Amino acid sequence: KTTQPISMDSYEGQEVNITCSHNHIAANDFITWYQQFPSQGPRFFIQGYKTNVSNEVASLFIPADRKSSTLSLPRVSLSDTAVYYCLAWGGTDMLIFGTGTRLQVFPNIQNPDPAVYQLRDSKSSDKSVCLFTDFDSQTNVSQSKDSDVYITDKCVLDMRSMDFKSNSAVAWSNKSDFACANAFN
Amino acid sequence: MIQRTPKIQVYSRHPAENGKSNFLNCYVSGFHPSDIEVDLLKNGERIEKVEHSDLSFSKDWSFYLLYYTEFTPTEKDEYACRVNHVTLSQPKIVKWDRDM
Amino acid sequence: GSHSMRYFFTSVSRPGRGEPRFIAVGYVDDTQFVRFDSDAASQRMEPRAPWIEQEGPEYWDGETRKVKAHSQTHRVDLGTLRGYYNQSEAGSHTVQRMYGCDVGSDWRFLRGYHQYAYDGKDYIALKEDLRSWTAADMAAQTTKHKWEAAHVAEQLRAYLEGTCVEWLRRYLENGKETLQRTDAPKTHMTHHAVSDHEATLRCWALSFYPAEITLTWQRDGEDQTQDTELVETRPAGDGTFQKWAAVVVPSGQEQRYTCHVQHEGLPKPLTLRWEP
Amino acid sequence: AGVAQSPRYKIIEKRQSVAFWCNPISGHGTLYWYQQILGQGPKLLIQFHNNGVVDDSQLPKDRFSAERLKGVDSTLKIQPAKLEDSAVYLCASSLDWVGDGERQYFGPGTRLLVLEDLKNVFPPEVAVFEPSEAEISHTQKATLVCLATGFYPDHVELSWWVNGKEVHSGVCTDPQPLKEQPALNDSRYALSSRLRVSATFWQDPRNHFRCQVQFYGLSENDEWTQDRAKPVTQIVSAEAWGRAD
Amino acid sequence: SLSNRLYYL
């Protein structure tokens, strides 16, 4: 049995360290880490034995007594957001994947310009949406299960072309009393 | 490719007493290869109800098997053990001797 | 005091019947506890001892899995050797594997084993230090070179010094009321006269476990070795063992011979002398 | 080289049959079927080497079964399915299943959703909202927004298309959908997306922007008694044209 | 328990 945190948060550009706990590791068992992105299958990430190992994607720190192990993403990208499974097994042994550790990599907004904008249906002007965008990563967007107020959580967009990233949340309602310039409050 | 010939012992599990149930054994040992025919006899006739241990072997790679049946010895019934193998040109029969 | 666990694998090609026969068994000391037979219905590892039955289904699953892997590795091995020894596909050949481990009374590691045989001869085996291989001939030199590059020694070692031992300790505790028992031999002597001249004294040891025993004849308290017959220790059928030793003797000199019996269940060794 | 599986999504009624397919890496002789219940990791269902079952101790034989009769492509099959079988069915291959420890290569999954009744299945409604002139003068950027609505289930895939080509730069779709009615138990979902482009680009009236939502729904051999339109697999889009002012 | 390590000859 491996045991690992259920979730882990992080900002892009930092070093990330997930801890695996495997006290009853068998003496020939290897320590192995799969990474699963959303809606993909798990893929092999890093494997270690009894001596520390680092490839071109991560580092595995393995103590001498091998009761625990530590995976070390050196400098995380938003693209590294995924579940990280930690297995201690060997040879003909089943993979026992467990719960994993859901890593989340939040972005590091270089020039925040927080603003709310209103967009009109490209068809029935009546229908319209509110866009809160350009806010920093410390700005946190509350949900709203109160009446017909619908608010998405922040989603980062990257315009690589111009090396620009932007946090953005969307709110909409069918009510006529729907206001734009407040609705994220 | 090394062949070895079966060694055969034929004996009871418990001290034999006439008219009292016991187990007739026949332990074959030190043979190679594993293909072996074994048959406990009663008055020179195959006994049906004969079970046998799982194939294991010794430190020299030679096989050993116990064949056994339930039986009640008398003072007139003769049991034996007939084993065949590639190393024996004909079946080797070995009478049960209760002092052995 | 001393204890072992050992697994024994035999696989024999049945050219024409295709699927090779594969039989695996497992022992603790001299008591068999698991078996697998490629020809059986169950196609799982089966129990051959009460105490191991208490093991849960995660166990049985995991052993059935492993044993199938064993069966597979051997089916392949059969062919590999066939080619290494440049033999043809018309003959039945035999491959045998044995591994296991040994511990003192402290229940600590003493020795481990991993060894292969092909057609009743040695093939390859792991030396006592479990750091290097002994290749019986030229053919098995090829397996050596491979398993060296593939760091097999290091891994198997860790199994034998580590895993293997822990499971024995467990099996021992779980089967304490059987495996850890010392059944001292029941001993008698018999007298049968071949002639007016010679006569046979037969010294018996029955219902003993474990099977490790020693019977020696001593003339006037000196090891008499010469006019002697000693049958192979044999299994009784009910988990105990049997042995006897014989001396043919000049009649009138019967009380000049003594049978000496050493077995772990006896506080002191036994001395037996024909009583009319 | 990747493992391939078909299909990606499957909606099925309680008590019905379903079948997943996998093609392992060419040569890999051991294949695996795993089941990934949502929020867990994959657990093994069954393991083949060449055409034979090495491990099936944990497979529910009452309903699950599998095949690899030529030792290459495989087919897992549930029949009759139960509600709790709603999972991703993953497939994997290995070179062999013996040795030091063999690295497994996984396919991308088949998402299976088993429903009590197929009457709660609804296609997506798609609107695209055009950039705010506020954003344009403040930033010289222009963020379209796309909204999928009333869709059940989440078997949906939203893509952005500029002038007939799919685009990914400047796009970000909600990693999750939103229960339109969080209260209710089989609620329909909604989903938003954003395409951000330069002002000068959005000002060109020649540029066509399209938001496309593919929905995996019912098929031929599903029954539709409801008077509403049969919620079949379909692609539902919405568009907006660039505007000089 | 059997071993998990199996290597071909």
Tab-separated table of C-alpha atoms in Angstrom, chain A residues 30 34 36 39-42 44 85 89-92 94-95 97-99 113 117-122 127-129 131 133-134 145 150-153 155-162 164 166 168-170 172, chain D residues 34 36 40-44 55 58 90 97 99-104 106-108 127-132 134-135 138-139 141 143 145 147 169-174 178 180 182 190 192 194 196-197 239-240:
chain	number	residue	atom	x	y	z
A	30	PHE	CA	10.205	-0.418	-7.011
A	34	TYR	CA	2.011	7.482	-13.208
A	36	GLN	CA	-3.041	11.100	-15.565
A	39	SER	CA	-9.880	12.573	-19.950
A	40	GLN	CA	-6.599	10.843	-20.921
A	41	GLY	CA	-5.281	7.453	-19.697
A	42	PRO	CA	-2.470	7.327	-17.039
A	44	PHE	CA	4.369	6.474	-16.930
A	85	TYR	CA	-0.420	8.100	-8.697
A	89	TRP	CA	5.175	-2.959	-6.635
A	90	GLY	CA	7.385	-5.240	-8.732
A	91	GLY	CA	7.574	-7.810	-11.557
A	92	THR	CA	4.378	-9.841	-11.950
A	94	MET	CA	-0.844	-6.003	-10.271
A	95	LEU	CA	-0.834	-2.221	-10.420
A	97	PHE	CA	-3.307	2.826	-8.296
A	98	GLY	CA	-5.313	4.209	-5.386
A	99	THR	CA	-6.657	7.726	-5.187
A	113	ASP	CA	-6.233	44.574	-15.232
A	117	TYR	CA	-17.542	43.340	-19.471
A	118	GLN	CA	-20.982	42.497	-20.924
A	119	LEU	CA	-21.365	40.515	-24.179
A	120	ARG	CA	-24.595	40.380	-26.257
A	121	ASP	CA	-26.023	37.221	-27.902
A	122	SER	CA	-24.862	37.172	-31.549
A	127	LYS	CA	-29.809	37.099	-24.097
A	128	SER	CA	-26.482	38.426	-22.735
A	129	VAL	CA	-23.510	37.303	-20.570
A	131	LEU	CA	-17.339	38.357	-18.299
A	133	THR	CA	-11.513	38.781	-16.795
A	134	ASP	CA	-7.920	39.996	-16.332
A	145	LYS	CA	-26.489	28.302	-6.079
A	150	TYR	CA	-24.799	31.006	-12.901
A	151	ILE	CA	-21.079	31.689	-12.404
A	152	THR	CA	-18.217	29.565	-13.787
A	153	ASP	CA	-14.945	29.226	-11.879
A	155	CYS	CA	-10.314	29.500	-16.323
A	156	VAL	CA	-6.871	30.672	-17.564
A	157	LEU	CA	-6.383	31.416	-21.291
A	158	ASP	CA	-2.886	31.649	-22.868
A	159	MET	CA	-2.359	33.722	-26.044
A	160	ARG	CA	1.137	32.166	-26.455
A	161	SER	CA	1.519	34.252	-29.658
A	162	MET	CA	1.937	37.337	-27.403
A	164	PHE	CA	-0.168	36.646	-22.307
A	166	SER	CA	-5.698	35.754	-18.531
A	168	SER	CA	-11.708	34.651	-16.678
A	169	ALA	CA	-15.106	33.823	-15.180
A	170	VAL	CA	-18.472	34.034	-16.816
A	172	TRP	CA	-25.306	34.792	-16.883
D	34	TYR	CA	-9.095	-1.591	-15.992
D	36	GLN	CA	-11.902	3.763	-13.314
D	40	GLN	CA	-10.712	6.714	-7.830
D	41	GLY	CA	-7.765	5.362	-9.789
D	42	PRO	CA	-8.015	2.438	-12.265
D	43	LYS	CA	-8.531	-1.064	-10.805
D	44	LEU	CA	-7.746	-4.169	-12.833
D	55	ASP	CA	-5.674	-12.963	-14.247
D	58	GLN	CA	-11.508	-9.951	-9.511
D	90	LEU	CA	-9.308	1.856	-19.568
D	97	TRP	CA	4.064	-9.186	-17.546
D	99	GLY	CA	10.754	-9.545	-15.126
D	100	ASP	CA	11.887	-6.556	-13.044
D	101	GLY	CA	8.542	-4.777	-13.547
D	102	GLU	CA	6.976	-3.893	-16.884
D	103	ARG	CA	5.818	-0.372	-17.797
D	104	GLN	CA	2.191	-0.297	-18.947
D	106	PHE	CA	-2.729	2.939	-21.497
D	107	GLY	CA	-5.413	3.910	-24.008
D	108	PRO	CA	-7.530	7.077	-23.521
D	127	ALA	CA	-24.889	30.464	-27.976
D	128	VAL	CA	-21.855	32.636	-28.835
D	129	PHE	CA	-21.646	36.170	-27.306
D	130	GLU	CA	-19.623	38.851	-29.127
D	131	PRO	CA	-16.772	40.980	-27.679
D	132	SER	CA	-17.513	44.109	-25.570
D	134	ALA	CA	-15.347	48.116	-23.475
D	135	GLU	CA	-12.760	45.344	-23.598
D	138	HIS	CA	-9.411	49.159	-22.764
D	139	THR	CA	-7.107	46.287	-23.902
D	141	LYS	CA	-8.143	42.455	-27.185
D	143	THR	CA	-12.952	37.841	-25.993
D	145	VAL	CA	-17.753	33.658	-25.032
D	147	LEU	CA	-22.232	28.759	-23.664
D	169	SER	CA	-4.473	29.553	-28.614
D	170	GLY	CA	-6.629	32.038	-26.671
D	171	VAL	CA	-9.215	29.385	-25.800
D	172	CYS	CA	-10.132	28.035	-22.339
D	173	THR	CA	-13.215	25.894	-21.685
D	174	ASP	CA	-14.479	25.246	-18.149
D	178	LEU	CA	-22.220	23.506	-13.940
D	180	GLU	CA	-28.075	24.133	-13.841
D	182	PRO	CA	-27.375	21.790	-8.171
D	190	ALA	CA	-24.098	24.039	-18.675
D	192	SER	CA	-18.817	28.051	-20.913
D	194	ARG	CA	-13.770	31.837	-24.139
D	196	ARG	CA	-9.620	35.743	-26.989
D	197	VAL	CA	-8.139	37.389	-30.085
D	239	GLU	CA	-21.313	31.598	-34.948
D	240	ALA	CA	-20.330	35.265	-35.012
